[PDB]
Amino acid sequence: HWGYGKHNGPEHWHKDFPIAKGERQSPVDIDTHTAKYDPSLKPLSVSYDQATSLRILNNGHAFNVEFDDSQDKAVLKGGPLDGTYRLIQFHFHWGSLDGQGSEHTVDKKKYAAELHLVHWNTKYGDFGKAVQQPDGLAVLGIFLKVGSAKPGLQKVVDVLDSIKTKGKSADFTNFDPRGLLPESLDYWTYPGSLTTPPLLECVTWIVLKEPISVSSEQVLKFRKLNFNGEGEPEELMVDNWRPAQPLKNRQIKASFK
């Protein structure tokens, strides 16, 4: 099926998912000199106080840390968002080299990786109904750069050896996602889509300005993961990022000047 190789990569997705060439696709390049400061944007509210992580899974495309979203234990509000959005999972996109890996770009600059914290609009009952709505999801995008290690990310890094191949999952309780946030919450925001098939245009993207630092040893462990399932030929899980798509008829707003 779909993947990131030469024969099933982003360039081929449009054949099975025509929305790939749609009106509001992601990711996109963020031109900081074109983004408009929107003073009508309310402060962003990240309430991960009662976050309840459950499992970590290798799905053949990346790894997801899932949370219990049956209640408003971990929600995102404010900013350009109306209503409450529940955290359902987070995952990363990274490269085979430190100069690439992120999905969104800033003035064309690519980062080593990108963290995506996925939330869904509670007004819609469940995640499945939410992806069918133009304002169904809110994804918090965070850039990763190679520098000093990130304490909050080591716990994830430590368990990657247990979910090396596609289909593997491991218990991952009591993880605190607040450990993955940078100091500042300044951000850029625009209407877009999921960056992987089905590429549904149901996402309000919130990309933070300030990246978090991770060590080379930490990113190296991400690169040790496998796209393939156990017993199959080994394909290193690297460069699982979709490149920037045309902004078209969209405007990127900034919460800061």
**Residues noted as catalytic:** 61
DSSP H/E element including 153: helix 151-159
Strand-pair partners of 142: 115
Do residues 138 and 127 make contact, with C-beta atoms less than 8 angstroms apart? Answer: no
Sign of CA dihedral 132, 134, 138, 140: positive
* Dmax (CA) of the chain: 54
Is 195 flagged in the annotation as binding? yes
Smallest gap from Cβ 39 to Zn ion, in A, equals 29
* 116 in contact with Zn ion (CB under 5 A): yes
d(C-alpha 31, C-alpha 207), whole Å: 12
Return the structure tokens found at 212. Answer: 């978090």
- What residue is closest to Zn ion based on CB? 116
d(C-alpha 51, C-alpha 35), whole Å: 32
Is 93 flagged in the annotation as binding? yes
Nearer to Zn ion, 69 or 103 (CB): 103
Smallest gap from Cβ 92 to Zn ion, in A, equals 8
Stretch that binds Zn ion, among 31-39, 81-89, 110-118, 205-213 (CB under 5 A): 110-118
User: Site mask, Zn ion, residues 69-108, x = CB under 5 A?
Assistant: ----------------------------------------
Return the structure tokens found at 169. Answer: 């999952």
Smallest gap from Cβ 231 to Zn ion, in A, equals 27
Q: Which amino acid is located at 155 in the chain?
A: K
Smallest gap from Cβ 114 to Zn ion, in A, equals 7
Binding-site entries for substrate? 195-196
Binding-site entries for Zn(2+)? 91, 93, 116
